[PDB]
Design a protein around this nucleic acid. Sequence first.
RNA 1: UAGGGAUCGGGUGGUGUUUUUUUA
RNA 2: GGCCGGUCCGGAUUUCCAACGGGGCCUUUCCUU
Lengths: 164, 56, 22, 272, 134, 645, 80, 127
Amino acid sequence: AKILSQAPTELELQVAQAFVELENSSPELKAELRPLQFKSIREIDVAGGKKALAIFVPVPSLAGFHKVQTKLTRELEKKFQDRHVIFLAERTLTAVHDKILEDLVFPTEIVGKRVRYLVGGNKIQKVLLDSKDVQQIDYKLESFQAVYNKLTGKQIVFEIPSET
Amino acid sequence: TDMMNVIDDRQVIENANLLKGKSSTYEVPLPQRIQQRHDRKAAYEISRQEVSKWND
Amino acid sequence: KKAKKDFYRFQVRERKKQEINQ
Amino acid sequence: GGAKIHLWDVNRLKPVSDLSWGADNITSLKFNQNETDILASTGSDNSIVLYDLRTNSPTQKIVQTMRTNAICWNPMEAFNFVTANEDHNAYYYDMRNLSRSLNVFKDHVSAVMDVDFSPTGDEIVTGSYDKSIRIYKTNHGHSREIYHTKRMQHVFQVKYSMDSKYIISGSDDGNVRLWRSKAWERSNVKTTREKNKLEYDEKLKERFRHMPEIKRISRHRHVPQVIKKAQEIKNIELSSIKRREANERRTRKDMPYISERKKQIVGTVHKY
Amino acid sequence: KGISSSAIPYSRNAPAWFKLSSESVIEQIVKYARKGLTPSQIGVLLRDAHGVTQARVITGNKIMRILKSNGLAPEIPEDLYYLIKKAVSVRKHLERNRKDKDAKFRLILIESRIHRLARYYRTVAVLPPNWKYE
Amino acid sequence: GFAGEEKDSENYHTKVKEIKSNKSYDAGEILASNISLTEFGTLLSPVKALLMVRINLRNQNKLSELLRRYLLGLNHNSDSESESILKFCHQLFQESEKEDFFLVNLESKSYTINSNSLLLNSTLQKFALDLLRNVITRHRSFLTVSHLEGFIPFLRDSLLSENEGVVISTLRILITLIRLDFSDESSEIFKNCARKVLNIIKVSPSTSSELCQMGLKFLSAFIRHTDSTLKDTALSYVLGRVLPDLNEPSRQGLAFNFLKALVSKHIMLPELYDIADTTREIMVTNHSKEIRDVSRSVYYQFLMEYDQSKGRLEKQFKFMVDNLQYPTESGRQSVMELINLIITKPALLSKLSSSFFLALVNVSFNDDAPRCREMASVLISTMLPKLENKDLEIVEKYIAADNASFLNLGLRTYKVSIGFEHTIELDELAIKRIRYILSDTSVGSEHQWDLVFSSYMEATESVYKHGWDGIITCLLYPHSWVANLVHQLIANKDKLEISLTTIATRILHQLGAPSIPANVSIKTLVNISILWKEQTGEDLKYTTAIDYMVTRGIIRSDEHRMDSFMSKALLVQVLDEDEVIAEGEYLETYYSRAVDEEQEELLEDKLQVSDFTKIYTAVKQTVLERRKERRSADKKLRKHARSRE
Amino acid sequence: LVQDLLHPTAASEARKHKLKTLVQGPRSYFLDVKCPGCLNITTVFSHAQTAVTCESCSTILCTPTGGKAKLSEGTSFRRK
Amino acid sequence: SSVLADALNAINNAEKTGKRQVLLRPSSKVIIKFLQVMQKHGYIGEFEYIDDHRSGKIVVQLNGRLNKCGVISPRFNVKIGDIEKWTANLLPARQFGYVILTTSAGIMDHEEARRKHVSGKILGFVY
RNA sequence: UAGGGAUCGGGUGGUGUUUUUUUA
RNA sequence: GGCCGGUCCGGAUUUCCAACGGGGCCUUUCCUU
Ligand SMILES: [Zn+2]
């Protein structure tokens, strides 16, 4: 319906059916899922075993996905459940890694990046999340660092300036 | 279920097919680090159990 | 209030129209 | 302890277990003396992490304000340890209730580099980054005695010999030195009249400890003047913080009292 | 001399409470500039009223860039404009009462501060050289 | 060396020659170079020439995979498959089994003790690795006892006293060698290394290490193929050590093979009943392929091949029912595969085939899309191998089981005592005749309103795909043929019915009117063109040509090209059919241009009619221009272009 | 006194000056105000520096001060 | 002044007055490399890179190993035959301390520079 | 070399008294 | 290199999973410059 012109996968058709299902349940949404489009989705497991769906959106609709993102992500975490899902941008290059991290985490925040240089010559690259949404944020941090790992090559550890 | 409640309505033979007298099982599960936090909480509880021995 | 009668190039357009009409 | 804590035996050349919580190095660690399966470590997350090797897992973590330099367990109590951290005081922690560091030994002026117990289990020894070691009783929280010499500098590793009589202080200028623990006693066998006399007036000093000139004599030492200046200006700024806190406590509705032992804890995983 | 500055936050996908679009911001900006508002004032008005954090982080480009991009740009930079009109006001005041040697000292300092960014602006050539004090 | 350091360094920006092809080079090189006498010695000697100084774990690990590349080259070409390499292996096994008062000494610097004594042992460990994969040269009919008894006393040392580098491969060799009956000393070595792996599991505080996993595979082989397995309480301890590791299935694998082996040898162990519970748990919830499958294998072998309590043997099926609703979309499919294996390879199938039928019906009515196909397949396999009374009560509950009754009628018909199925079809005909009320007319009215849930419809379309009563069904099929896919299925059913047995004009006009106001629509268009060729002959032909001109968005344009291809006397009937196909003479526009070239290729009278139609289109352009010039959207005549670009 | 020069306590971070922290930040905050003439929402800065006027019911909402702008006596705000 | 130079003055006199942690901003990448090699040789301890958007703040934690860092102004070329005389007139003793050079193939001290057999222009020194 | 007590100018927060209340 | 039958009671057939390496290759498509 609203994909890019390449032939999708069957689970892409299933999540597209979820999209047209939310469009069938129309008049609670403010015609928000009329200008949608995605280039491609791709799903990949984490070391925890469960999978994650990177959906690449051609970026007027990263900001077009404005306040609809939370409602539709709990909607499709009910419909195509148990697989952690994320929306991403696409193609110096530190800027594009920065931006894909910035929308990769959530529309929540990041508040600071550290990288400590140990005495063995290694480095540890920490990113620091906001203070909020933590009961659903903590459930997906290893997924976030796994998808940043296999989407950048870099190594990143997420943490919150909180207890855990 | 809705299908079970629509089917098993008339006949007396229910104790052969309607074995589902108990609710479901097998949660999602929880993710890896949260499972780690839970069972190491259990580890801290059994460790405090095993040194409350040494208290006396 | 704090609008300006200067400082913009459409304002140099209106003031060149001023300085050629007067 | 390295970039991640590894458990291995001497029979195989690979780490038998990873053990870390996450991506943070492990600055020191120490096994237990009894319940030998349990151990503790300190990471540069300003964090204490206890591990149990029966379950082969870390088991709790607390985060404090400043970085913990060195742990040492108790030989006698077996579930109490001492952390030495970089704020200038050592912390006699429990293990079973890690939310109240049940003693704070305070009288230092710089970072406390290591610590260990006496083998008799009631007298601990801290060596710190200022050029002075000092020996604490367990149930006081202030210095029993200060040892320093002009040639020792930045004393890093102080340990207690296995007969509770000598204090080995390895400094930063290279030298490792011996000290007595009870600095007035001597190490020969004594005839029983000498033993009865020294023990007699030991008990006598103990019961007349609070007379106000026995106390000044038994409290008088001679510290180097760097430590003297740092201790007295630490005293005047602590009095200033206490006074300004008293003013806020006079005005404001609810600035609740926190204990001195609970002050330095900034967090604890597994709240109960 | 001390410090008195704003500290713009670490965030740059700002600010997630912004219901408004990114085109009405440019519409409000060109409205205020063709009302005749200097870059600083249009920035502060849509910061307070139609609350943006800053337009350089809500829109993808600073407001001088979007003023040039909508054909509304100034002919002299804002700092040189404000400092020039301060110079002409203090000159008019000293012309009125010529005994104010404190205003003379301040006018010398103001003209030196004019010449500083004037020769800076000649070296970067935003306004063209041969330019010396209108 | 320095080129490798500069290739893996960091202050080194770029070049095109970056990826190190040397690791591939040697595995391509020793194919030719396997003299295995002299040049292979000149391969392994510069290994030691750096392995006598100092080597970190990084250099060690890349050298270990470099030796793996050597061994892969030997797997490709093994130059002599007769024992000249085996004597070479045995050879390297034998190889890897007051004066200071005058002495000025200046610029003093101490050396370190690491240099000799790490390299005293590490070279031996790597030689044992290289050599022992060289013994896992796997070529059949080259393993004899007379071949291998020279090597047993060497591997019996580097099994015990090795420290972890080669042990995993030495007992892999013993897994390969457990088939061949060796001498008595060597069978004692087999039992001795069984005690060794028992002590390995006794010392290691994790079974999810590669050492314990490989040793579990060795104990799997030792359980399966020897004369007398023993130390049964010891292997019960081993299994009790295994069971808390199965919270994390991660290359356990080998461990499940161990479970397979002792559940095949059928030893009564009371902890296996908890092993079955945890393997059912990870069988559903585990989020990998093939680990769920081997867990299905072990759980199924336990459930079919061990005993059970007479309440527990149905309690596990109650667990099967409770996992039939599982929220992920593949663990449920693994549940379906195990239920398939339950129904296949018994009176247990009859005893459980009522609850299983009801649960498979509820899983057919589930929400997962590709699992519904497996639900249909398992429902068909459960209905076909069912008993008499079980299938009778199943069809009774399916008949009696309003949209619930519709879905149950559709499912019972899809599974479908053929006279009893026809009686169910009679009740379904009572449903179907009441299941045609103004729906296609409402669909046409919605199409006209647009130009200004079909559940029973899809169920009756399924019943029509299953099927004077059939003639009345074909009449109702025209009523719903004349919800887009529902109308497409109705059109497919009516096309099949009209191919089976004025009416053609009405059918073709209702087919054409649906395209104006899909692949199934293309099939119905081909069927309607077949009916138009089978067909007031010239009047209906002019009606079809007028319908093609009214047709001539990509689907309707393809329908117009298909109708013109079905139309193409050659032009005496096609005079009134090129009124729009020549008017068209943007990838859909490129395909329409290809369609116009197709219509132009597929003739003197046709060319004359085409020239007259071109003049008529010029006349129509003149008439539209005259209407416009008499009317004269000034800025609207450019607003379209200014809004397009 | 003696502070961990890395990540300190939040009680000290909210205490020291907004420049002098390890990573600087703002301290003003946006907030939704209801103009009491016609009840509809507008956002407003805290150190608002100018007299905002809710153009729907154009009364006045906050007059500025040297620091935080005080709000006009019938207004109602949500911090956000 | 320079950006490496005042950071080195900071971590010099701060441990001269005997502290354990220092702060240094603006933390350019040459400062990163310069104290990267000194924690490689064990003269400071671990160090954190707080990264704001402005320039970054390096926080070095250090023990009492070090006594003097220092930069050389200006940064002029030296040969393999020159680094020995520069270690002579730049360090107190010979086999003690290091001299840090921006070499062409990396950023290293004098012993790894003469080990990889390269050179470059002199940068700074630490003993 | 650092620390402390004030004091002036601005700001933030607290919550008692001087203050007041539909004129700003 | 491991996991699955189906030919017969351990030699040939096969699916999937990993590790290397091989080939076509996805992104200046609209524009003076
Ligand atoms: Zn209003």
